[PDB]
Amino acid sequence: DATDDYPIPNRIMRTPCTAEQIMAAARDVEPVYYERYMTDYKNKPPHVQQAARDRIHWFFSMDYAGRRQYSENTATDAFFEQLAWMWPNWAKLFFNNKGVAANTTDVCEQYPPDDMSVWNWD
Numbered sequence: 001d002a003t004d005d006y007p008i009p010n011r012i013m014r015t016p017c018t019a020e021q022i023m024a025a026a027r028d029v030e031p032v033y034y035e036r037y038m039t040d041y042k043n044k045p046p047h048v049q050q051a052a053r054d055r056i057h058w059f060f061s062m063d064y065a066g067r068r069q070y071s072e073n074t075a076t077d078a079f080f081e082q083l084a085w086m087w088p089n090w091a092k093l094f095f096n097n098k099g100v101a102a103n104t105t106d107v108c109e110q111y112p113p114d115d116m117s118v119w120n121w122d
């Protein structure tokens, strides 16, 4: 039920980067996407914020096989991901579209892996 790029962009399933690398890249090369995401994030309660960080860290901790199985799970069942009951767009910056995915993954490796400052906005 998944395609190569939907629901999760191919480049995102293949990248060696952390979430924080992709976010730092977005801040520079996809700033509108970054700012839309952080605006959404900052409006969520702390428990939801924490859950999104934990879940995206889990996602990028997997290899391609794990990421692809997640994509398949969410392609076959739109309600697979429990976080979506609280925040459907918890991973919008990462998974929304392949153009953003290509731009961010083209440069994410140039950024530091663990820079948590990307989670602080205003």
Ligand SMILES: OC[C@H]1O[C@@](CO)(O[C@H]2O[C@H](CO)[C@@H](O)[C@H](O)[C@H]2O)[C@@H](O)[C@@H]1O
Pocket (backbone or CB within 6 Å): 007, 008, 074, 078, 079, 080, 081, 083, 084, 087, 088, 089, 090, 091, 092, 093, 095, 096
């Ligand atoms: O497709 C609905 C399903 O997708 C999830 C996967 O975690 O949401 C992420 O992926 C979507 C599809 O690419 C993005 O549009 C969305 O912004 C992102 O959070 C789940 O939350 C949801 O159950």
